[PDB]
Design a protein around this ligand. Structure first.
Ligand SMILES: O=P(O)(O)OC[C@@H](O)CO
Ligand SMILES: [Ca+2]
Ligand SMILES: [Mn+2]
Length: 381
């Protein structure tokens, strides 16, 4: 099955969890001034983006993420633990939207959008707080890859810009490398931002997807210890492509600062590019699964301390960064973010206690009994 049933799963356990997080949400909201629905929010999955400087045995002639590193220094930012290497985009994507961690589902599950999403009777996501007309998805490939068209349709999205398979198209398409440039994606976001509305964007880039082809900037060269010629060439091409993403990401944020609407971007790489041999990580194999993320608003930014989080934690972190009031569900997810996520020991009693709360909710809304249907305020702010 898709998930193990918690040993204490029952109507009474779900009731206890719902009452517990109802009170915690009230406690949290006493110190949260803002409303999430007053913010336009962009979830920006930057395909295969991850600083090569963290790969121990790699040397790059130049810093290829200088602007993104400066952004990370200025706002809530850190490392994201990914569930896969060289692929798995849609699984990280699912976790950002639902906040349900892949690590709590069965190891038999390969793709959440195909095996778990269709079984959810009433999937709760960050997008539900926005009007359907203001929910926009964007991905420069087929809308049907990884079942995305079905997912975004069932989430009530008004638009899904795709290269094929949707009525919604990207404008002024240009390639940087072999695939659609990040500049194209960013400029298409900007053209759809409507300051008179609160909008939710779910964006999945393609520029830095395998295979990597770039001859310039020629001064950017990269090598790894004992790498083959092919490995070094792929790393060099990838680093060159990152340099464009880095500059275009800065230019994108600069444009967002000039829009008279509160806008927050959750930016993250989904997984490392699948070009490094295991030897590249030299006894620090954890770095095979650690990408960069930041959470940046177009006004004043706090910098909350979250050096290592999971993709499923982004929504709770977004509420905290924007000082937005939470539902009981997001109160639980805030407890996960702070006390029970991937930076903590899974053997810690506190981690296990909070994870038991989460697993019961996660089971209930996927393949369980839907006991939460009787707790009408659990997902409400
Ligand atoms: O990185 P992967 O898992 O191949 O995902 C690519 C997919 O988003 C293309 O439509
Ligand atoms: Ca506050
Ligand atoms: Mn990917």
């Amino acid at each position: 099955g898709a998930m193990e049933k918690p040993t204490n799963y029952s109507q009474e356990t779900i009731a206890s969890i719902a009452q517990k997080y109802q009170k915690l949400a009230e406690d949290i909201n006493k110190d949260r001034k803002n409303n999430i629905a007053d913010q336009t929010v962009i979830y920006l999955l930057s395909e295969s983006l991850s600083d090569p400087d963290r790969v121990s045995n790699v040397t790059v002639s130049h810093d290829v993420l200088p602007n993104i590193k400066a952004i990370k220094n200025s706002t809530t930012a850190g490392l994201m633990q990914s569930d896969s290497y060289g692929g798995g985009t849609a699984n990280m994507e699912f976790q950002t939207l639902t906040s349900l961690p892949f690590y709590n589902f069965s190891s038999s599950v390969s793709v959440l959008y195909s095996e778990v999403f269709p079984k959810m009777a009433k999937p709760h996501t960050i997008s539900e707080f926005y009007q359907g007309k203001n929910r926009i998805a964007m991905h420069p490939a087929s809308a049907n890859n990884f079942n995305r068209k079905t997912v975004y349709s069932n989430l009530g999205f008004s638009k899904f810009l795709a290269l094929s398979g949707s009525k919604d198209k990207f404008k002024n398409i240009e390639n940087v490398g072999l695939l659609t440039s990040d500049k194209t994606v960013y400029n298409n976001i900007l053209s759809l931002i409507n300051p008179s509305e609160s909008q939710f964007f779910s964006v999945i880039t393609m520029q830095n997807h395998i295979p990597w082809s770039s001859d310039y900037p020629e001064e950017i060269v990269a090598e790894g210890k004992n790498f083959t010629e092919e490995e070094n060439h792929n790393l060099t091409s990838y680093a060159r492509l990152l340099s464009f993403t880095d500059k275009e990401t800065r230019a994108f944020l600069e444009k967002l600062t000039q829009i008279n609407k509160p806008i927050t971007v959750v930016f993250y790489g989904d997984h490392l590019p699948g070009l490094y041999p295991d030897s590249a990580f030299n006894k620090h194999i954890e770095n095979k699964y650690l990408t960069d993320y930041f959470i940046w608003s177009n006004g004043t930014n706090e910098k909350k301390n979250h050096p290592l989080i999971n993709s499923s934690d982004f929504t709770a972190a977004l509420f905290e960064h924007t000082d937005s009031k939470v539902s009981p569900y997001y109160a639980l997810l805030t407890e996960v973010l702070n006390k029970a996520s991937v930076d903590k020991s899974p053997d810690s009693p506190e981690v296990k206690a909070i994870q038991n709360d989460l697993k019961n909710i996660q089971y209930d809304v996927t393949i369980g009994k839907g006991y939460l249907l009787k707790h009408k305020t659990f997902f409400k702010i």
